[PDB]
């Protein structure tokens, strides 16, 4: 019988890392907050390289500051660099409200007391700016543990703890909290539409829609996170939390349940049809609202489109998928709905104890008719080496830092997850939901079609399908 | 005079870093502070010392494992970010290596973790026999002895050669310190450890060129035409072993005097090899450079044949662009040297007015050069930050900004076009052809219908939508 | 420096760009609710066109044949029309509209379509007293024009038929909109624009539901949404907005002559300026302001295009083929993003009209490179010019040109009709601001994939 096997990378070192380090993910969490400038306590590269990474994915600038740790502070302590950095930010950015103070390998190794610096800064800020409130959140993100996925989740949780500690529980809002995880602006646009069509009030944490900002006649800069202090504080007042990503915000939903008795509902990340269906069923359950006819229609249009592709072009084609764990596991399920065979799943960090318990692994074990290898703690050399050793793949799905693997092996690749810098506009295209499943399926087919043309592999067949 | 910008009222120390050149001043009284500590919290453009070693210099090499001893982020962050092709399939851009430091290694030491990672890298790619190992913030802090580990690996693997760099990010103030440590370690440890066959009467090293979009390969067409053997390129399209041979050259030709002046200085001191500084950007600059190289070697006529052919091929296109770019205002917000390589070359060859310049990490030497060559009414900024860029834009109103892509994407919102002053748009930009490439991208950036369309508010009944007529050389 | 119009220099065709008139008439008709066109001619004239629509849309559309056979070729085919109408009416109880579309055969033999319509009207009134079926005569000989002209003729004839029957009533306050031959995605975009600008409008024909769901209840919803009532109400509109000179403007003029509904023909809204000018015309005729939401969509489109134009597009040479309104509109879009459309191919005998198109002059006054506009073109014209040395970086056209691009190793973006060799393109807008953005990003992504497959500076796709 077919076997779904979990295995670790068998090397100590990394070649071609799948993810960045924790502080990068904490920066990504923070840039989704309005009137927020994260402050990365460590050497300058820890900031500047991540600002470049976000420019690669989004083709936009995001504001993140460094504490500029130098030799003196590496030897004698960096608290004064934190403290000066906070004050320089507040003095030069009058509308600044939130500063996640993100540690790095350096400042974790030397043991700077971030909570003590925050007390110093709160004192200093209260004296200098008696009419402002600036929220300083301690974010402990040593890069020698976890990855950007864990750092994202840690920063969301710390910021929510900080803001809700200050505000507490108050008037019930009647809204859902929604933690979609690390998704694109197009994913956020699709979720907002779903809630609007279902007549469900919701805050999406973080609201990154406006990362795709206009070039306007008045030259105004609108490239900002839309989640406010007020939105975050109101999370204590929600009817329920819908957590879409076990590794990308569910721990914040759990904290709000523990602290404020907001019930948390973790569902499978909504990649593919069944996972979207079950997300909408959970929203209906928690809210008492009906699923609208408009979503039945969108679902039906997606199924119509995928039916043009599945047995003709996808059946029995083997796929490798890499990316964030919620995305890898969700896309594996989507692939099987359209008769693709996801034979190799690669997840890129040290969280294997958690992944072994993910219920979607069992869901795959109970459905797959082909062997699946799930490599955890994987790097992208694990994919390249397996292709070199003879693994036959028809498709790769992953982010752009794997591009050379696909190019050299002459395998079509669909760009998913983060970062997708080597194609245009993908941050605007949904991947989740019904429309997203349709868009993903058509991206797969179109990549295969172009490959058939370039390789002259039955290219004449693209006429009467 | 020196300038206190409004956005710097609460960091008034920045006045000593910003010079507005005015008539009759003795510029010796107005040299920006440079290469000093960064101010925390400013959104300085600076990077780290590790970047200057691995990303900028060592990582250019085509045949060398780049083993970053540290947690995974420093590796991730230096991969898929540079444009330095090779003639072996771009090995340097396809791969990055990390020791994947974990907490146990912080507590108990990372030397065995490095040693294992090095053996794995050499085992995974048996035809690669050269490696540079770099420290990063935490492996420096815990005192791992990477030289001792490298020596043990070399003993156990007689096929390999390893170089080590102690370059944590917090060293120095910027990328600059990584340049220094790498240069000095390379000449102390690896120069004069190999020789190559000398195949010309005329030999040189080309020092301080990193093959951005093929710059080095373009310049090599000149050296091949002139019959000059390049012993080593430091480090564009280079090999580890070529760099071991640098002591053999008769001449060191320097372009990037900031990153690579150190090794030219030490090669002159130790081996007597003269240092010749040139500008390998700029059309008339390139001619001067070739004439100096040819005068040194006594091959003046060969140089004049090359120059005459290159002018006949490229000068008419360059002049077409000059006609349309004359009087345009440019800003240059890059590392440092391109400010002094470009301010007077774009003025001389394209008629372009450089109105504002910022250097991430330049030294006072770089400011001496740029202010010598630059215009009155121009701003000269050491270690510029984001809010300063906005205020400078209001002051000088540039038509185009040469800067990195993220800042380009920021100033786009203000309807100001950019050219990538680091990795180029459509390069190479060095040499005669390259300056035409640079002019073409500048032209297409500013003479761009989208800028005009973006300005129109379709709600304004008084406004129409224009059509713009462009050209091509 | 020169924009030159020239005809194809061969009498024959190799690789035709368009189908014949009746195919276009069928396309017009399938956008009407409760309509089954009846194509009076041999069986291939129907079945091949139903297949063509299945290729583009991946859907079935109902069209019937009169099944002309040998006896009718000798004695005339009127009885085949008359039978075909009754057999439709008897077997499709909800049928309301039958455009009776002629073909080369039935134009050559001179069957009297209007006489057959009088017979069928009498028969239908007697047999179905409580039903009204509208029979529209559509004269579409295939030996002139093309599917473009046949589309325009059918729209006009259906509108004449239905408005003749119902005449002028109470003012509706709505616009009439003739977008021409566009995709469902283009219709979805236009509906959003009118909704955001608070403008009531009928879009003729409304083909949104051609992209129909696969539903739990097994319902078939693949239909045109434009009703008899919607067409009849065109007489009562405030104004007509015609987006396509060759694809429905002549119906806008007919409604102006017959019912004094003022027609406004505008440049087809490909690219930014043409979209801007369309919206200004809507504002002028309705008195409604252009909403902030469209300023923002425009700005998002410009932001995206600005990431592409000077880096990847400038000085790249483009050939474009397709319907004339699409070719001329895409040429203007291309120049906005610094592409150079050096070869425009338009596929039919309407050159005396194309020579007067104001967009030609807009190109002659703008372009800094020679443009050749070949009218009466086939796709061999493109292939032959490439074989003779024409250097192209991009082709934009429909899927029947695919082998030209494949063999020449030139990236190709699929636009216009039919686009059967890629998935989902009928759902993606090409017009408007979002459409301009989507087109530009298809262009870039086609270039990017080409750079990877050909190893042409593929390392550059990192920090653009
Ligand atoms: S200033 Fe430079 S890039 Fe920064 S750590 Fe230091 S050498 Fe490196 Fe590394 S793993 Fe991540 S990115 Fe940092 S927190 Fe550490
Ligand atoms: S039954 Fe067969 S396909 Fe029909 S015409 Fe006759 S041989 Fe030909 Fe031709 S041009 Fe068009 S498709 Fe017709 S109307 Fe004439
Ligand atoms: Mg369908
Ligand atoms: Mg943008």
| DSSP code per residue over C208-265 | GGGS----TT-----S--B-HHHHHGGGG-SEEEE--TTTTHHHHHHHHHHH---EEE
Q: Which residues of A touch B100 (CB under 8 A)?
A: 12-14
B405 with C299: Cβ contact below 8 A: no
Q: Which residues of A touch B95 (CB under 8 A)?
A: 15-16, 381
Pair C269, C184: CB distance under 8 Å: no
- Give domain status of residue A310, yes or no: yes
Q: Which residues of B touch C310 (CB under 8 A)?
A: 417, 425, 441, 444-445, 448
Of C399, C424, C445, the CB nearest to A424: C445
Do C402 and C330 sit in the same domain of this protein?
A: yes
In chain C, which residues are last before a break of more than 2.5 Å from C to the next N?
none
SS3 state at C67: coil
- Give domain status of residue C273, yes or no: yes
Do A351 and A446 sit in the same domain of this protein?
A: no
Do C372 and C285 sit in the same domain of this protein?
A: no
Do C280 and C307 sit in the same domain of this protein?
A: yes
Q: Which residues contact A75 (CB under 8 A, 6 or more apart)?
A: none
B57: which 2 tokens? 């210099």
Number of domains in chain A: 4
Alpha-carbon gap, residue A185 to B367, rounded angstroms: 43
Do A120 and A96 sit in the same domain of this protein?
A: yes
Q: Buried b vs exposed e over A140-166: b needs ≥16 C-beta within 10 Å?
A: bbbbbbbbbbbbbbbbbbbbbbbbbee
Interface list for chain A against chain C, based on CB atoms closer than 8 Å: 52, 55-56, 59, 212-217, 296-297, 299-301, 303-305, 307-309, 400, 403, 407, 421-425, 428, 438-439, 441-442, 445-446, 449-450, 453-454, 459, 462-465
- Give domain status of residue C141, yes or no: yes
The values of phi and psi at residue C264, to 5°, are -120, 110
CB pairs under 8 A between B and C: 91
Edge-to-edge strands of the sheet including C394-397?
Answer: C3-7, C371-375, C340-345, C317-321, C394-397, C412-414
B128: which 2 tokens? 């690669």
Helix-then-strand count for chain C, H and E? 18, 14
Alpha-carbon gap, residue A5 to A345, rounded angstroms: 10
CA–chain centroid gap for A375, Å, is 20
Alpha-carbon gap, residue B346 to B343, rounded angstroms: 6
Write the residue with the smallest CA distance to atom 9 of ligand 1: B74
Pair B358, B45: CB distance under 8 Å: yes
A396–chain C nearest CA distance, Å: 15
Residue whose pair of structure tokens reads 């053997």 in the numeric block: B229
Do A353 and A259 sit in the same domain of this protein?
A: no
| C neighbour chains, 3+ CB pairs within 8 Å | A, B
Q: Which residues contact A333 (CB under 8 A, 6 or more apart)?
A: A268, A271, A272, A274, A275, A360, A363, A364
Check if C42 has its Cβ closer than 6 Å to any atom of ligand 2: yes
Count other Cβ atoms within 10 Å, centred on residue B271: 15
B137 with A104: Cβ contact below 8 A: yes
- The beta-strand segments (E) located in C362-455 are 371-375, 394-397, 412-414
From the candidates A214, A301, A406, A460, which should be mutated to test the interface with C, based on the most C CB atoms within 10 A? Answer: A214
Do A246 and A115 sit in the same domain of this protein?
A: no
Pocket test for ligand 2, best of C69, C103, C148, C151 (most atoms within 8 A of CB): C103
Between A359-367 and A325-337, two packed helices, what is the crossing angle to 10 degrees? Answer: 20
Alpha-carbon gap, residue C405 to B257, rounded angstroms: 48
- Give domain status of residue A15, yes or no: no
Alpha-carbon gap, residue B301 to C343, rounded angstroms: 47
Do A325 and A246 sit in the same domain of this protein?
A: no
B73 with A46: Cβ contact below 8 A: yes
- Give domain status of residue C222, yes or no: yes
Of C289, C309, C337, the CB nearest to B459: C289
Do C336 and C292 sit in the same domain of this protein?
A: no
Pairing outcome for strands B18-20 and B379-382: antiparallel
Point out which residues pair with B67 in neighbouring strands. B97, B133
- The beta-strand segments (E) located in A141-260 are 176-179, 202-204, 240-243
Do C194 and C239 sit in the same domain of this protein?
A: yes
Alpha-carbon gap, residue B340 to A13, rounded angstroms: 42
- Give domain status of residue C2, yes or no: no
Residue A456 is classified by DSSP as: T
The answer to whether C444 contacts chain B (CB < 8 Å) is no
The answer to whether B169 contacts chain A (CB < 8 Å) is yes
Q: Is C35 annotated as a binding residue?
A: no
Alpha-carbon gap, residue B208 to B337, rounded angstroms: 11
C304 with A425: Cβ contact below 8 A: yes
End-to-end CA distance of chain A: 34
Obtained via which technique? X-ray
CA dihedral A80, A86, A87, A88 (to 10 degrees): 100
Check if C145 has its Cβ closer than 6 Å to any atom of ligand 2: no
- Give domain status of residue A6, yes or no: no
- For residue A437, give its domain range: 270-316+433-465
Residue C32 is classified by DSSP as: B
Alpha-carbon gap, residue C242 to C258, rounded angstroms: 16
> What is the experimental resolution, given in Å to one decimal place?
1.0
End-to-end CA distance of chain C: 31
Alpha-carbon gap, residue B61 to B51, rounded angstroms: 15
Do C124 and C38 sit in the same domain of this protein?
A: yes
Chain B neighbours among A 214-243 (CB < 8 Å)? 215-221, 223
Check if C360 has its Cβ closer than 6 Å to any atom of ligand 2: no
Q: Which residues of A touch B80 (CB under 8 A)?
A: 56, 400-401, 421
Q: Buried b vs exposed e over A426-442: b needs ≥16 C-beta within 10 Å?
A: bbbbbbbbbbbbbbbbb
Closest of A315, A354, A305, A132 to residue A229, by C-alpha? A132
- The beta-strand segments (E) located in C103-156 are 134-138
The answer to whether A385 contacts chain B (CB < 8 Å) is yes
Around ion ligand 3, residues with a beta carbon closer than 5 Å are A 304; C 58
B465 with C272: Cβ contact below 8 A: yes
Decide which of A269, A302, A333 is a domain's last residue: A269
Do A308 and A452 sit in the same domain of this protein?
A: yes
SS3 state at C50: helix
Count other Cβ atoms within 10 Å, centred on residue B126: 8
Q: Which residues contact B251 (CB under 8 A, 6 or more apart)?
A: B203, B204, B205, B273, B274, B276, B293, B296, B297
Q: Which residues contact B301 (CB under 8 A, 6 or more apart)?
A: none
**CA–centroid distance, residue A324 to ligand 1 (Å):** 21
The values of phi and psi at residue A56, to 5°, are -65, -50
Stated as kind and residue range, the H or E segment containing C3 is strand C3-7
- Give domain status of residue C170, yes or no: yes
């Amino acid at each position: 019988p077919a076997e779904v096997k979990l295995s670790p990378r068998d090397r100590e070192g990394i070649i071609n890392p799948m993810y960045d380090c924790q502080p990068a993910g904490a920066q990504y969490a923070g840039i989704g907050i309005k009137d927020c400038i994260p402050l990365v306590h460590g050497g300058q590269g820890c900031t500047m390289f991540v600002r470049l990474l976000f420019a690669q994915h989004f083709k936009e600038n995001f504001d993140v500051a460094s504490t500029s740790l130098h030799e003196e502070s590496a030897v004698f302590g960096g608290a004064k660099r934190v403290e000066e950095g906070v004050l320089v930010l507040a003095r030069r950015y009058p509308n600044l409200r939130v500063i996640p103070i993100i540690t790095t390998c350096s400042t974790e190794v030397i043991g700077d007391d971030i909570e003590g610096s925050i007390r110093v800064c709160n004192r200093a800020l209260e004296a200098e700016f008696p009419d402002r409130k600036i929220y300083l959140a301690p974010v402990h993100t040593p890069s020698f543990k976890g990855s950007h996925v864990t750092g994202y989740a840690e920063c969301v949780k710390s910021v929510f703890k900080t803001i809700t500690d200050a505000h507490g529980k108050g008037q019930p809002s009647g809204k859902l909290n929604v933690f979609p995880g690390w998704v694109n602006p197009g994913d956020v646009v699709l979720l907002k539409r779903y809630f609007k069509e279902m007549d469900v009030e919701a805050n999406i944490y973080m609201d990154t829609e406006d990362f795709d900002s206009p070039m306007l006649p008045n030259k105004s800069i609108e490239t900002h996170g839309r989640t406010t202090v007020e939105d975050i504080a109101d999370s204590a007042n929600a009817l329920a939390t819908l957590s879409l990503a076990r590794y990308e915000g569910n721990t914040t939903g759990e904290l709000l349940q523990k602290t404020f008795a907001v019930p948390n509902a973790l569902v499978n990340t909504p990649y593919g049809i069944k996972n979207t269906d079950d997300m909408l069923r959970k929203i209906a359950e928690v809210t008492g609202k009906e699923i609208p006819e408009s979503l039945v229609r969108e679902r039906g249009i997606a199924l119509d489109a995928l039916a043009d592709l599945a047995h003709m072009f996808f059946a029995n084609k083997k796929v490798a998928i890499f990316g964030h764990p919620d995305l890898v596991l969700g896309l594996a399920q989507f692939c099987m709905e359209v008769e693709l065979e996801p034979v190799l799943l690669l997840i890129g960090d040290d969280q294997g104890n958690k992944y072994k318990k993910d219920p979607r692994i069992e869901e795959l074990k109970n459905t797959a008719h082909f062997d699946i290898e799930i490599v955890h703690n994987a790097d992208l050399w694990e994919l390249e080496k397996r292709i070199n050793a003879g693994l036959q793949l028809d498709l790769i799905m992953g982010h752009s830092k794997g591009r050379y693997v696909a190019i050299e092996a002459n395998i079509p690749m669909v760009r998913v997850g983060f970062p997708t810098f080597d194609r245009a506009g993908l941050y605007r295209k949904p991947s989740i939901g019904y429309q997203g499943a349709m868009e993903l399926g058509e991206m797969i087919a179109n990549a295969m079609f172009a490959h058939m043309e370039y390789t002259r592999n039955k290219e004449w067949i693209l006429n009467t399908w | 005079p020196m300038v206190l910008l409004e956005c710097d009222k609460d960091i008034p120390e920045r006045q000593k870093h910003i010079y507005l050149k005015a008539p009759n001043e003795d510029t010796r009284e107005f040299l920006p502070i440079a290469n000093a500590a960064t101010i925390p919290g400013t959104l300085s453009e600076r990077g780290c010392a590790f970047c200057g070693a691995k990303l900028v210099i060592g990582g250019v090499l085509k045949d060398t494992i780049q083993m970053i001893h540290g947690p995974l982020g420093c590796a991730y962050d230096t991969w898929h970010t540079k444009r330095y092709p090779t003639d072996n399939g771009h090995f340097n851009m396809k791969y990055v290596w990390s020791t994947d430091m974990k907490e146990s290694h912080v507590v108990f030491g990372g030397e065995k973790r490095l040693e294992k990672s090095m053996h794995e890298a050499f085992d995974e790619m048996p035809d690669i026999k050269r490696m540079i190992v770099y420290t990063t913030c935490p492996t420096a802090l815990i005192g791992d002895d990477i030289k001792a580990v490298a020596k043990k690996v070399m003993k156990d693997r007689p096929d390999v050669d390893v170089f080590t760099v102690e370059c944590p990010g917090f060293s120095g103030v910027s990328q600059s310190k990584g340049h220094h440590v790498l240069n000095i370690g390379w000449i102390n440890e690896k120069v004069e450890t190999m020789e190559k066959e000398i195949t010309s009467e005329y030999t040189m090293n080309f020092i301080g060129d990193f093959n951005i979009q093929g710059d080095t390969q373009l310049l090599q067409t000149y050296w091949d035409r002139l019959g000059i053997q390049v012993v080593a390129h430091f480090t564009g399209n280079g090999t580890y072993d070529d760099l071991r041979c640098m002591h053999q050259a008769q001449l060191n030709v320097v372009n990037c005097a900031r990153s690579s002046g150190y090794i030219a200085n030490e090669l002159k001191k130790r081996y007597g090899i003269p240092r010749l500084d040139i500008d390998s950007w700029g059309f008339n600059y390139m001619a001067e450079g070739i004439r100096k190289i040819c005068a040194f070697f006594g091959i003046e006529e060969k140089g004049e044949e090359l120059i005459a052919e290159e002018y006949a091929k490229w000068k008419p296109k360059l002049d077409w662009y000059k006609e349309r770019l004359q009087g345009k205002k440019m800003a240059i917000w890059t590392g440092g040297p391109r400010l002094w390589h470009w301010t007077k070359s774009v003025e001389d060859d394209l008629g372009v007015q450089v109105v504002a310049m910022s250097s991430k990490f330049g030294h006072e030497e770089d400011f001496e050069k740029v202010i010598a060559r630059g215009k009155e009414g121009t701003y000269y900024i050491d270690d510029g930050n984001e809010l300063e860029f906005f205020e400078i834009i209001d002051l000088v109103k540039p038509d185009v900004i040469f800067t990195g892509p993220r800042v380009g994407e920021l100033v786009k919102k203000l309807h100001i076009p950019y050219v990538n002053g680091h990795g180029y748009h459509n390069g190479p930009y060095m040499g005669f052809e390259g300056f035409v490439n640079l002019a073409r991208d500048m032209y297409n950036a500013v003479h761009n219908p989208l800028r005009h369309l973006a300005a129109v508010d379709i709600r304004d009944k008084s406004q129409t939508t224009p059509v713009i007529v462009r050209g091509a050389a």
